Design an enzyme around this catalytic site. Structure first.
Site, PDB file in Angstrom:
ATOM      1  N   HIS A 256      -1.406  -8.296  -3.157  1.00  0.00           N
ATOM      2  CA  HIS A 256      -1.901  -6.934  -3.340  1.00  0.00           C
ATOM      3  C   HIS A 256      -0.879  -5.871  -2.904  1.00  0.00           C
ATOM      4  CE1 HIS A 256      -3.867  -7.314   0.897  1.00  0.00           C
ATOM      5  NE2 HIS A 256      -2.832  -6.508   1.014  1.00  0.00           N
TER       6      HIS A 256
ATOM      7  N   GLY B 215      -2.509  -1.429   7.242  1.00  0.00           N
ATOM      8  CA  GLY B 215      -1.113  -1.819   7.261  1.00  0.00           C
ATOM      9  C   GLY B 215      -0.879  -3.198   7.864  1.00  0.00           C
TER      10      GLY B 215
ATOM     11  N   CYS C  77      -1.847  -6.191   6.689  1.00  0.00           N
ATOM     12  CA  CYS C  77      -1.803  -7.244   5.672  1.00  0.00           C
ATOM     13  C   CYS C  77      -0.384  -7.844   5.683  1.00  0.00           C
ATOM     14  CB  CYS C  77      -2.102  -6.819   4.227  1.00  0.00           C
ATOM     15  SG  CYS C  77      -3.437  -5.580   4.152  1.00  0.00           S
TER      16      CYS C  77
HETATM   17  C1  LIG Z   1      -0.910  -3.301   4.347  1.00  0.00           C
HETATM   18  C2  LIG Z   1      -2.184  -3.507   4.050  1.00  0.00           C
HETATM   19  C3  LIG Z   1      -3.146  -2.342   3.561  1.00  0.00           C
HETATM   20  N1  LIG Z   1      -4.675  -2.838   3.526  1.00  0.00           N
HETATM   21  C4  LIG Z   1      -5.261  -2.883   2.317  1.00  0.00           C
HETATM   22  C5  LIG Z   1      -4.628  -2.589   1.089  1.00  0.00           C
HETATM   23  C6  LIG Z   1      -3.638  -3.427   0.540  1.00  0.00           C
HETATM   24  C7  LIG Z   1      -2.997  -3.133  -0.666  1.00  0.00           C
HETATM   25  C8  LIG Z   1      -3.351  -1.987  -1.365  1.00  0.00           C
HETATM   26  C9  LIG Z   1      -4.334  -1.153  -0.823  1.00  0.00           C
HETATM   27 CL1  LIG Z   1      -4.792   0.318  -1.708  1.00  0.00          CL
HETATM   28  C10 LIG Z   1      -4.966  -1.436   0.385  1.00  0.00           C
HETATM   29  C11 LIG Z   1      -6.612  -3.339   2.398  1.00  0.00           C
HETATM   30  N2  LIG Z   1      -7.481  -3.529   1.381  1.00  0.00           N
HETATM   31  N3  LIG Z   1      -8.374  -2.585   0.913  1.00  0.00           N
HETATM   32  N4  LIG Z   1      -9.145  -3.181  -0.066  1.00  0.00           N
HETATM   33  C12 LIG Z   1      -8.750  -4.485  -0.165  1.00  0.00           C
HETATM   34  C13 LIG Z   1      -9.212  -5.560  -0.990  1.00  0.00           C
HETATM   35  C14 LIG Z   1      -8.577  -6.811  -0.904  1.00  0.00           C
HETATM   36  C15 LIG Z   1      -7.540  -7.037   0.018  1.00  0.00           C
HETATM   37  C16 LIG Z   1      -7.107  -5.991   0.844  1.00  0.00           C
HETATM   38  C17 LIG Z   1      -7.726  -4.706   0.736  1.00  0.00           C
HETATM   39  C18 LIG Z   1      -7.157  -3.628   3.689  1.00  0.00           C
HETATM   40  O1  LIG Z   1      -8.432  -4.054   3.965  1.00  0.00           O
HETATM   41  N5  LIG Z   1      -6.481  -3.526   4.861  1.00  0.00           N
HETATM   42  C19 LIG Z   1      -6.878  -3.724   6.036  1.00  0.00           C
HETATM   43  C20 LIG Z   1      -6.775  -5.025   6.552  1.00  0.00           C
HETATM   44  N6  LIG Z   1      -7.293  -5.302   7.906  1.00  0.00           N
HETATM   45  C21 LIG Z   1      -7.801  -4.362   8.561  1.00  0.00           C
HETATM   46  C22 LIG Z   1      -7.929  -2.999   8.100  1.00  0.00           C
HETATM   47  C23 LIG Z   1      -8.536  -1.984   8.923  1.00  0.00           C
HETATM   48  C24 LIG Z   1      -8.622  -0.616   8.397  1.00  0.00           C
HETATM   49  C25 LIG Z   1      -8.175  -0.340   7.160  1.00  0.00           C
HETATM   50  C26 LIG Z   1      -7.584  -1.327   6.349  1.00  0.00           C
HETATM   51  C27 LIG Z   1      -7.466  -2.674   6.838  1.00  0.00           C
HETATM   52  C28 LIG Z   1      -5.131  -3.014   4.689  1.00  0.00           C
HETATM   53  O2  LIG Z   1      -4.481  -2.888   5.674  1.00  0.00           O
END
Ligand SMILES: C=CCn1c(-c2cccc(Cl)c2)c(-n2nnc3ccccc32)c(=O)n(-c2cncc3ccccc23)c1=O
Ligand SMILES: C=CCn1c(-c2cccc(Cl)c2)c(-n2nnc3ccccc32)c(=O)n(-c2cncc3ccccc23)c1=O
Lengths: 305, 305
Positions: free
Chosen positions: A41, A143, A145
């Protein structure tokens, strides 16, 4: 001598973390040999994440659209391919800090250390279990991921997890390093439910053994039980069924303490039926299930790396 | 997004750990620049530890009696001196892995990460607090002396602790890196008592703030209180007195949540008076006090190194 949620030393993994950017999405990658692994992603915008067609989205992406940064150094991307839910970026430079390593897909109930990273930089390290419903209860912000979970045996790093997402419930889901999710989750921002989170009974037993080793003995009772009798009680309290493999794996802790596994099961049973009465075990006021029998032995015997 | 007892990434400290042997006693040392630091009780046998005269015992020891091993490499000792309860061995080689670093003497209630080591090798890492009675509740086995506690700010390692001993109660005592014990303890195997272990009230408050940030809100009540009224309650429950410096340090968490510090104090008061009723906060069934306000903010904001 004390008992802590102890993670593995993280230096071997620190030197593999890099930052991966594609367009305006930045997250962490793992640089081993001449390949960088990261969540696929990375190629998505916010609008994509609602319903992404990854194969279509990736067609729009060439080698030079992936920016890979290792500390300050910029790596040259010479190849890319999608494997399940991870991307593998071939770079022109082998990581000189590559440890000996393996990719492994862990079983629910097993534990591992997480090195939480932001922008390719380590923030902190903590120990985690793969829950029976295949989620983890982590500490992850936007951030994070791409951050990875691992175990270490002597000099070899076994990577078992790559963080991908937070569910609407605030628990965490992700993949092994072949990109296959743990559990039924998908890398799409749709509501997804985890399933019943049960307790890892063999891990609770191990921690009770740990408590005895450390002098915390108040919960040892006069009873014993049977595997079928205990599992009747486990089912009522949403505990995982205990099997004979589990009894077997507890053999060394039983031997060390002189407490037969089924006797310890009857003590657990009474704790489930009567609660803890305001007392504590190893400084916890509830039954802990994030220590495996190997963790207990490792901690109580000083295994190093 | 979750909340964990998170330690600092330990790679910077791993590359400083060495093994120090004197006669038949082996423990860990810390190799920074061309000096190795270790507990002075490396020079003692079992018979010595009952009542050691360190100055007399050290007179019998020359440079070549200290064997310092860094991985497989043997370091050449060209100088030794005792500073309070640590030994400083001058070696002929600067550590090439020396990070930027400082020696700091922490205050009770502050937290730090421990890298538990055996024979100069890392075993695991965990987060700890200096208790108000100057003990720590660690996880340490025989051979762990010399393992170090630290904090990391960006690229700088602040060493604050060096493990020396286990008390007969099973809690742990040791020194700063100038060799001065935390607390009244001495490096002698005599019974020594720790004093009343009180709870770090400002850390409990911070963790309550953490809980609110993470959605755990059930304990917020309708009351407020005053600093003197709250401290009457703190004293009864062996909680540290809360001062206006503490209120001040909680200012950013109060601002983030819109919960005035004294309102949160009244919620804590009601939790102390009524208990938790079988409920949990951030997955704990008791009030946690090993997170500082800085830890809470650091974790909830993704500070990296
Ligand atoms: C660097 C990572 C950013 N990334 C993203 C994201 C990744 C790529 C593009 C976008 Cl546009 C968003 C999240 N997304 N969003 N929809 C998701 C559906 C499927 C998988 C991941 C998803 C995501 O959940 N997370 C969080 C992971 N763990 C904890 C979090 C706590 C607060 C906010 C975000 C968190 C990301 O960090
Ligand atoms: C490598 C360290 C060995 N060392 C020793 C020790 C050190 C030098 C000579 C000897 Cl003869 C013994 C301990 N001693 N013993 N008396 C002591 C009085 C003052 C200070 C330390 C003391 C000691 O407490 N510890 C433990 C520290 N932490 C946890 C432990 C858990 C189990 C067993 C020992 C533990 C040592 O590891």
């Amino acid at each position: 001598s004390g008992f802590r949620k102890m993670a593995f030393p993280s230096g071997k993994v620190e030197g593999c973390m890099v930052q991966v950017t594609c367009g305006t999405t930045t997250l962490n990658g793992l640089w081993l040999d001449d390949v960088v692994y990261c969540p696929r992603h990375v190629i998505c915008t916010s609008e994509d994440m609602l319903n992404p067609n990854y194969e279509d989205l990736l067609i729009r992406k060439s080698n030079h659209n992936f920016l890979v940064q290792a500390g300050n150094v910029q790596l040259r991307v010479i190849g890319h391919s999608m494997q399940n839910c991870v991307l593998k970026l071939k770079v022109d430079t082998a990581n000189p800090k590559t440890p000996k390593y393996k990719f492994v897909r862990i079983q629910p109930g097993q534990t591992f250390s997480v090195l939480a990273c932001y922008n390719g930089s380590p923030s902190g390290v903590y120990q985690c279990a793969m829950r029976p419903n295949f989620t983890i209860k982590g500490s992850f912000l936007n951030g994070s991921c791409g951050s990875v979970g691992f175990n270490i045996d002597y000099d070899c790093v076994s990577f078992c997890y790559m963080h991908h997402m937070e569910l609407p419930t605030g628990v965490h889901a992700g993949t092994d390093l072949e990109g296959n999710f743990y559990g039924p989750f998908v890398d799409r921002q749709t509501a997804q439910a985890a399933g019943t989170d049960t307790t890892i009974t063999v891990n609770v037993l191990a921690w009770l053994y740990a408590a005895v080793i450390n002098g915390d003995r108040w919960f040892l009772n006069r009873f014993t039980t049977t595997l079928n009798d205990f599992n009747l009680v486990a089912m009522k309290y949403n505990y995982e069924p205990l099997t004979q493999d589990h009894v077997d794996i507890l053999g060394p802790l039983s031997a060390q303490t002189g407490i037969a596994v089924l006797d310890m099961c009857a003590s657990l049973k009474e704790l489930l039926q009567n609660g803890m009465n305001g007392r504590t075990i190893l400084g916890s006021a509830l039954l802990e299930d994030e220590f495996t029998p190997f963790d207990v032995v490792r901690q109580c015997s000083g295994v190093t790396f």
